[PDB]
């Protein structure tokens with residue numbers, strides 16, 4: 001029982017069969033001496049009388065659109081959502097967990113203050129997501145998230161397609177700092193046409209960094225069957241590269257790491273490949289870039 | 294230069310924290326409880342940044358800064374790093390003294406990081422509560438030494 | 451401090467003789483409560499106003515030092531408790547001297563190992579107003595079964611009797627032995 | 640003759656289903672079922688000649704109250720009647736086959752099968768195996784500690800194809816739903 005937005009209320013209904021539901025008092029916001037009639041979209045006929053109606057919410061049948069009518073006109077409308085609760089644990093059914101049993105996957109390409117948060121829905125009718133910085137202190141770091149958009153990268157889990165939603169967010173500060181102390185915490189308000197679910201996450205912007213592959217991987221022949229593999233820093237990575245550094249991994253197709261932008265090794269007759277990673281933290285590795293032997 | 298000593302300090306800190314990660318895993322190191330030691334001589338968070346991201350001015354002297362890269366905020370950066378290291382070294386010596394005096398050998402503070410801090414110093418100027426305090430001090434010092442390595446690598450190379 | 455959410459206390463002392471009971475009082479500072487037991491860094495046993503302050507009882511605690519931590523989730527605070535025994539009185543205290551005119555060293559029996567920090571005081575005494583005292587520290591790293599008096603003796607003595615005593619001190623009580631007596635005409639070897 | 644052995648049950652946490660087996664020739668049959676309860680209110684769903692119906696939570700159907708189900712099939716100008724079932728749908732759960740690729744390991748005259756499942760209850764695993772020359776042989780697997788489960792099977796001097804399933808069980812040992820369908824076949828050489 002709380003007001004999500006104007007004339008939109010949400011209730012917490014326990015999903016136990018024998019358990020009783022909640023009682024809701026809904027009042028049309030205009031007074032008239034004439035008795036106020038009530039109508040619903042999930043039910044037929046007049047359901048209420050007077051300006052105040054009591055509803056025993058027990059299931060998704062007792063939710064939806066409630067309208068107050070007088071004479072031959074309407075006065076106001078008020079929605080009503082549900083929030084499932086099961087054995088004390090709130091439901092998580094709109095979203096599908098990733099491979100690592102998490103719901104929200106956020107990734108940043110550099111130390112610029114912008115990132116991308118994505119999730120995996122289960123069905124695709126009437127989803128209205130909303131991502132915002134769930135502040136809990138006056139000094140909490142604040143982000144300005146954008147509108148959630150569909151992505152055409154249908155992922156495969158359980159040998160089954162799952163459709164992917166993505167949103168772009170950017171943290172803004174008065175002037176940037178040297179390190180990160182208070183983690184970014186985010187809240188998602190998912191809803192499926194009557195059903196309301198709340199998700200939450202918290203992370204730093206340093207353990208979610210996923211760099212880009214090297215852009216110009218080439219190859220120089222040298223004497224006695226030994227060659228040179230050279231690459232370059234990605235153009236999307238933060239500048240300068242002396243302060244933000246990387247360690248690259250080289251594998252011939254078990255790999256050895258190189259801190260310089262040039263390595264030498266003998267070939268086997270197949271595609272040699274490099275990937276990038278942050279030197280200090282154990283951040284996520286990049287996708288490989290390659291060059292034929 | 295001081296960069297090699299800084300990398301040695303990073304390696305020793307990583308080794309000792311990875312040992313503490315199983316030796317004191319049950320106390321508080323398994324949540325993270327990010328709290329640091331100083332909030333008011335913590336100028337490193339505002340000055341130790343490259344001179345290409347300093348958009349606004351709102352954000353000892355040292356003897357290891359090269360003269361090919363001389364600036365105004367860099368001396369404050371190195372002085373604040375020195376003062377933060379002074380506080381960290383004082384607290385680490387105190388906690389080591391309080392840790393050897395009891396009959397529990399389930400933790401060791403190797404002197405490699407202590408002497409690494411000491412040479413970084415000399416180059417830069419010419420019960421149960423103690424172990425969890427050590428865990429939180431390490432959880433702050435890891436990010437501190439990463440920041441120090443970043444700024445000194447930018448300053449030297 | 452570091453145990454900011456609350457505190458844990460034990461009675462009557464963190465050091466307890468073997469095979470006794472223990473009481474743990476876990477209190478929570480304003481703005482449930484269970485206990486977790488760790489023996490040799492291994493989780494062994496899992497033990498309104500109920501969430502504000504509570505007490506827990508422990509019977510037949512494990513041998514050696516162990517850990518009790520109070521749990522809400524977040525660890526509010528914890529405590530370590532060492533259990534042992536008072537030192538048994540020593541036995542068979544012999545003293546020998548190495549050299550023509552040098553220093554005597556003395557050996558004894560420590561009995562059962564105390565399992566905790568303990569020290570032993572060696573006291574040499576003798577007439578014509580001569581005495582000497584020092585310590586030796588027994589713990590998990592260093593053991594004390596031999597000691598050196600560090601004092602040179604004189605060869606002109608052939609008539610008196612000297613006294614050697616040893617006392618055992620720890621936090622669980624004191625212990626002494628017989629004030630043994632020896633003669634200074636055959637120590638030299 | 641006529642529809643028989645109706646079974647409405649719950650395929651997934653947010654989804655529900657119903658099935659029935661029809662006897663007789665199929666020439667112009669149209670299958671619709673009626674869902675009745677007391678809000679009477681007898682809604683009906685249409686699926687044509689198919690013999691399965693899928694719905695979910697927000698289709699305006701009661702899943703926490705007592706619900707009556709029955710089926711009317713079509714034949715020209717005549718109807719065929721079915722039995723009535725009265726049940727709840729939330730706690731009559733049909734579980735899933737084993738999740739994804741399972742791990743098979745061979746020991747002396749034995750095969751051990753392991754997997755990861757998203758149900759904490761002990762499902763009575765009943766498996767079946769078949770060497771590719773003859774028909775199938777059935778067998779119960781046995782109780783296990785429950786996350787992850789294990790199954791055992793005797794070997795064979797030739798290769799074989801083996802399938803495995805689960806069903807939900809209460810704490811009383813009572814059958815908590817219908818039998819889940821078999822997983823993908825597992826092939827093992829000798």
Ligand SMILES: *[C@@H]1O[C@H](CO)[C@@H](O[C@@H]2O[C@H](CO)[C@@H](O[C@@H]3O[C@H](CO)[C@@H](O)[C@H](O[C@H]4O[C@H](CO)[C@@H](O)[C@H](O)[C@@H]4O)[C@@H]3O)[C@H](O)[C@H]2NC(C)=O)[C@H](O)[C@H]1NC(C)=O
Nearest residue numbers: 001002003012083090133134135186187188197198199200
């Ligand atoms: C995440 O989702 C959860 C739901 O699982 C959600 O928790 C709910 O939050 C709302 C508001 O934040 C809570 O509603 C409040 O409950 C308290 C205690 O009952 C009331 O006192 C509040 O009264 C408000 O409204 C009155 C009338 O408008 C005002 O007069 C009064 O001053 C208050 O403003 C209000 O009803 C609700 O109880 C919880 N649900 C729980 C605890 O189960 C949560 O907000 C979502 N978001 C985040 C970031 O967690």
Ligand SMILES: *[C@@H]1O[C@H](CO)[C@@H](O)[C@H](O)[C@H]1NC(C)=O
Nearest residue numbers: 461462470471472473505507
């Ligand atoms: C623990 O407290 C109870 C009552 O609070 C008391 O009876 C008992 O003796 C105490 N235990 C010890 C070892 O003193």
Ligand SMILES: *[C@@H]1O[C@H](CO)[C@@H](O)[C@H](O)[C@H]1NC(C)=O
Nearest residue numbers: 617618619622623624625626
């Ligand atoms: C030993 O300890 C007891 C404890 O009260 C004390 O009374 C006694 O005097 C002590 N004896 C010696 C020799 O220290």
Ligand SMILES: *[C@@H]1O[C@H](CO)[C@@H](O)[C@H](O)[C@H]1NC(C)=O
Nearest residue numbers: 017018727730731814815816
């Ligand atoms: C499901 O819930 C109903 C409600 O009373 C109960 O009668 C029944 O025993 C439960 N279990 C099954 C398997 O139907």
Ligand SMILES: *[C@@H]1O[C@H](CO)[C@@H](O)[C@H](O)[C@H]1NC(C)=O
Nearest residue numbers: 740741742753754755786787
């Ligand atoms: C099940 O999950 C665990 C996670 O710890 C994993 O180690 C294992 O390989 C998985 N598969 C099995 C047990 O078949």
